[PDB]
Design a protein around this ligand. Structure first.
Ligand SMILES: O=c1ccc2cc(Cl)ccc2[nH]1
Ligand SMILES: O=c1ccc2cc(Cl)ccc2[nH]1
Lengths: 238, 238
């Protein structure tokens, strides 16, 4: 996260850090708890990931220093990528992780509500992007979970800023005209969380941008409400 | 290493990478093979290291990507720190690691010769500092082992550049007046290797500097020849 601040412990209790153990263990991407066995994240996080066995999901984390060889984690039983996903910049940047065991909800770990189709008209004015990613384009993973409040921009505005792309209604953009606050490398798959009528909603999934926090380059997020049917379909038993 | 280049595989076969496994595994410092059970490194590398059990020594490495959970390593049986060591900037920045098993020498892993007391008069003109450390003061560990050729400076010259320190005859300095090539964070404990009469000698141990590669700030190294008695004393059986 560029231009953000350190989070209060457990103020984003749906935020997980997804590690890979290959070759040695490291943070890979963010994610969000959406059900007892389900993390919502970005499809592009799994480039070159050939098996779920090398994945570990860590809930209830503020600082990456909390994560040691003795720290409990959730194994991944299945990676589900959207069948239309090819790459972040063409959309469908969405995946589910089915965990090997169920999360026991507590104050430090609980699920975020999915956006309602009836809230598409809702102007979300209180949105935050969170993660352990870079503070600048060339940097490293941050110890403490960072947050930044970022205004949504309209899809029309966002299209003017990415003239070589197709910004579709399955994407949602957020940023300041002058830049300075944004997601960056390592934040992908994490939430864009918007508080509306005292409830937190998972409005977007951190997906891509041109650089990080640049003037006139809004962050591009997966527009989660366009995928609630897909999520329902994919999270049913057998 | 600042201002260096990628090494040829195994051109520094005495160079090891010392990892810590706590909290998760990462490169800690460089080191040099000086005997079948012995790595020479910097005392200051062990700040906060309470047990040798969390140390792993990896020989025969060019790229950090080679190191995975299935990669063979040497355990550390004992950390021996100079009894006069307090901190890098006051000298005695030297330690031995006694390995749990013996290294089998090969083309990719073999010991570097210690400098001779008779070579103190020798003007070493072919010296190289090597490691996986930062390319700039705020950066991260590099994948490929870097090298940089660096001229030794006299202890008199070095003292003029560090007026708030005591540069003693137990230190040796190396750098360009204009800066630009130097060791940096993560290179400590590694060799300053000087080739003389077709033989490589371990002249220094990467220890400290003010920043990395700055104008008029030579790298400061442990002057290994001042410690050959100590090394002999500490590497004897029982
Ligand atoms: O480099 C990056 C990687 C991800 C990324 C994600 C958003 Cl949402 C914005 C900028 C970004 N920049
Ligand atoms: O930050 C650092 C750390 C180690 C270090 C070592 C030498 Cl030899 C020179 C500069 C240095 N700068």
């Amino acid at each position: 996260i560029v231009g953000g601040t350190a989070s209060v412990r457990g103020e984003w209790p749906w935020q997980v850090t997804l590690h890979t153990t290959s070759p040695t263990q490291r943070h890979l991407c963010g994610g969000s708890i959406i059900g007892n066995q389900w993390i919502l994240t970005a499809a592009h996080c799994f480039y070159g990931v050939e098996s779920p066995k090398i994945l570990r999901v860590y809930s209830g984390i503020l600082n990456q220093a909390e994560i040691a060889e003795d720290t409990s984690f959730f194994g991944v039983q299945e990676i589900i990528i959207h069948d239309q996903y090819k790459m972040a910049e063409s959309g469908y940047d969405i995946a589910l992780l089915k965990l090997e065991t169920t999360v026991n909800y507590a104050d430090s770990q609980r699920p975020i509500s999915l956006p309602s189709k009836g809230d598409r008209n809702v102007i979300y004015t209180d949105c935050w992007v969170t993660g352990w990613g870079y503070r600048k384009l060339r940097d490293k993973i941050q110890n403490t979970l960072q947050k930044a409040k970022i205004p949504l921009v309209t899809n029309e505005e966002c299209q003017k800023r990415y003239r070589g792309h197709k910004i579709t209604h399955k994407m949602i953009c957020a940023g300041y005209r002058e830049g300075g606050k944004d997601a960056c490398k390592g934040d992908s798959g994490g939430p864009l969380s918007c508080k509306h009528n005292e409830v937190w909603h998972l409005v977007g999934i951190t997906s891509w941008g041109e650089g990080c926090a640049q003037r006139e380059r809004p962050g591009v997020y997966t527009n989660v409400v366009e995928y609630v049917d897909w999520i329902l379909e994919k999270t049913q038993a057998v």
